[PDB]
Design a protein around this ligand. Structure first.
Ligand SMILES: [Mg+2]
Ligand SMILES: [Mg+2]
Lengths: 251, 251, 251, 251
């Protein structure tokens, strides 16, 4: 309770799934939140479901849209004051091996999962540093930032990039005393409506050879590690990877 | 607040420093705690400083003492009910390169830092599994479980061992549905009275080439990640390494 | 001696530095080699400096040029027969933090260091699979695929991406029994004429806080690990990272 | 051919399997070799199977025997001159989870797999430093130094320890300009006569969920990486881990 007192957070892809759970717990611990998403119909319903406009608002945005990032920050500042916390959560996947990935698929995925994370991280550092906010940038990877999957080629590329880029940003921010931390979170498989929509997906992910726990996680498993990283409890963590994966990467 | 509702924790080396901060925050979040340490004079004062006997007690023990482990568990059960949570925190260091380590130094260090962790982990699994406790075993490494230090040879050995042994235990516990998670925590340098006692130590550890933040951490930086791992918030994390190091290992 | 009997290799950025040493040793070990580079004057002179056209040729190419990759594979086949070995070595750097990277610098570095490696890996799998060649794709990272550097933000993103994408491609090729291995090489600092042109650069890179050996490496340190990976000596190695760094990443 | 000109190597557990293939290739590449093993009958026959006494000899030793290590180095010097290269290959396994490991099994496995490697590394540094030998210490781990296995608890502890202790020793040797490199080798599953004696073992280890290549390796896959590490070809490699696993750890 009140673990995020006074924080102001942007969560990209905050209207569904993992993003939405992050938002929900952020609001519960006292943060002001701006969630983003591509569809206003979903976005505005999501925001209202979590709380009132003085707690949480929606902002329509594609994380691959560089200019929209500037608008997003300005809007969040107008609503809630200076942003302290950024969760780069929006992502997409392509279910293809490297061999079978088209160039269009490659660029589309990178623009969200890599360029978007870059735009958010770069803008977040510039806007959040040197303000005594206890600022924190939480970049969503994946277990796919640690291990390959033969049918997630471009996704693996994007998540390996976010992993190491985040260390670079962490170190610069530390060395320059910016009061900004940057860390990555690496979910294993997580049960969401989208997973429920793909027959047999949870069942495959729940095989012991994939997830040793023999079941997949839930959105709140990611929201709780994000609360920790956004909070000043984690003021000495920067440049680190936080895995919450049911044992996936342990074997 | 009440993040450790109903938990019963053993924290080895709980009377000083990082251990003591863990204990303090554990009690604050509603856990019952048994702290261990080598000296009763220090131990009993430490326990009373944190709370009353129905919250926290001391138990004298050297973590390298296999038979004492059994007593420790029995005592903790007698005081507080079934143990749910084990923090293997007790450790020592030897300030020697591998080349310059005597065999006596080697065995002494291993007996605490490796055998002790093994005895605790093995006994913890046996006593905690299959009880619906939400059991959690948190094994203290180190940044020295990731990277070498030329003057910490045996220490590096012990911390690399704990790191991977912990994954083995994690996986067995998961695959057998024991309801026990095992994870490791990897502090960077942390300011304690013992560090304050070694002239120039904090100053050396605070050089940017060591810790990018340009200062070292404090005991509560470790206590907070331990609260998370002991709590059911982290029910999908097992077999993972959690680093809190000021950027040390990021560069 | 004759460690690469019968192999046919493409080495991108093969006209200078690391690439040129790889090419030199490849030819010494009996491979046929196509080197690429941006300047025809340089490339032709480099090929002739190594051997005759029956051993080594040049093909002008920018590794970001998708169509030109098809032309390079066609050309190499026409000269030497079916390609067995690809070294994705071309790369560029931007000396900027994430915070200070322009979008143009981001895209230009990614086009070479990431898209180019994708284009080469994808086409290499297509062309080399299922031909009993003992095919091997060697993707040049860097130490910057393991650790961050505060002033190499885009470069870190690109080297992280190559690291994990290469595991994805390894796994698919193994699972499909393609007779293609994929592995990464991670040089630390290496002395080249370009380093020699920057006063003080080698000395800085040779500080013990950077390279524990107290000096930097030479192009042949990367050529020898590449001969191992290209040869059938490494037939059981796939999806692995091979680091040759003077200790940089060990501390 | 002549890749180990002038070298003098000790290989522990050199009479069978991986060790014997290392010894065979070492001799083929011009090294002088002392192999160790427990059974004199086996050892003498193995040495003679590889070459003559001017190329290779046997010394009976249990790698847990501290004093015998001094005797082994003395003996090797007397036969061949100053030792340049040490391969710490001897090891044993216990097929138990952490939970089910007796203390006796723990101590017996650690004495060989951990203390023995310490004793060899320590004495090797002492003996090989500062002699212009291009000295190289190659510590055999395993994939079990990266990932856990639920039924190899003590083995995982020992392989984690060797992994990181070896980085400590690398760093000290580099920093002190000792002309000693230390690196680890991490085999995945390898076909030997001992595997062949367990019905079904190879088939199980060859499942794609274990080894993506769908088959296991052979002793020469580990011998070739060891020739690279022992040779001056790898003069800039220290403190690194070299994995040869058929993809095991990539997924
Ligand atoms: Mg795995
Ligand atoms: Mg480092």
């Amino acid at each position: 309770s009140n673990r995020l007192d006074g924080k102001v957070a942007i969560i990209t892809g905050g209207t569904l799934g993992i993003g939405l759970a992050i938002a929900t717990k952020f609001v519960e611990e006292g943060a002001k939140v701006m969630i983003t998403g591509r569809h206003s119909d979903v976005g505005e319903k999501a925001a209202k479901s979590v709380g009132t406009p003085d707690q949480i608002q929606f902002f329509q945005h594609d994380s691959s849209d560089e200019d929209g990032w500037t608008k997003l920050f300005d809007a969040t500042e107008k609503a809630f004051g200076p942003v302290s916390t950024l969760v780069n959560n929006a992502g997409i996947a392509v279910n293809k091996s490297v061999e079978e990935t088209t160039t269009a698929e490659w660029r589309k995925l990178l623009a969200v999962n890599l360029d978007g994370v870059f735009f958010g991280t770069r803008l977040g550092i510039q806007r959040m540093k040197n303000k005594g906010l206890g600022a924190s940038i939480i970049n969503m990877s994946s277990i796919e930032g640690f291990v390959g999957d033969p049918s997630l080629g471009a996704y693996n590329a994007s998540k390996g990039a976010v992993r190491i880029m985040s260390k670079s940003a962490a170190l610069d921010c530390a060395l320059k005393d910016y009061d900004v931390r940057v860390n990555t979170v690496h979910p294993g498989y997580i049960k969401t409506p989208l997973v429920d929509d793909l027959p047999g997906a949870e069942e495959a992910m729940s095989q012991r050879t994939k997830t040793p726990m023999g079941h997949i996680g839930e959105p709140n498993d990611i929201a709780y590690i994000c609360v920790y990283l956004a909070s000043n409890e984690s003021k000495f963590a920067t440049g680190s990877e936080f895995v919450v994966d049911g044992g996936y990467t342990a074997q």
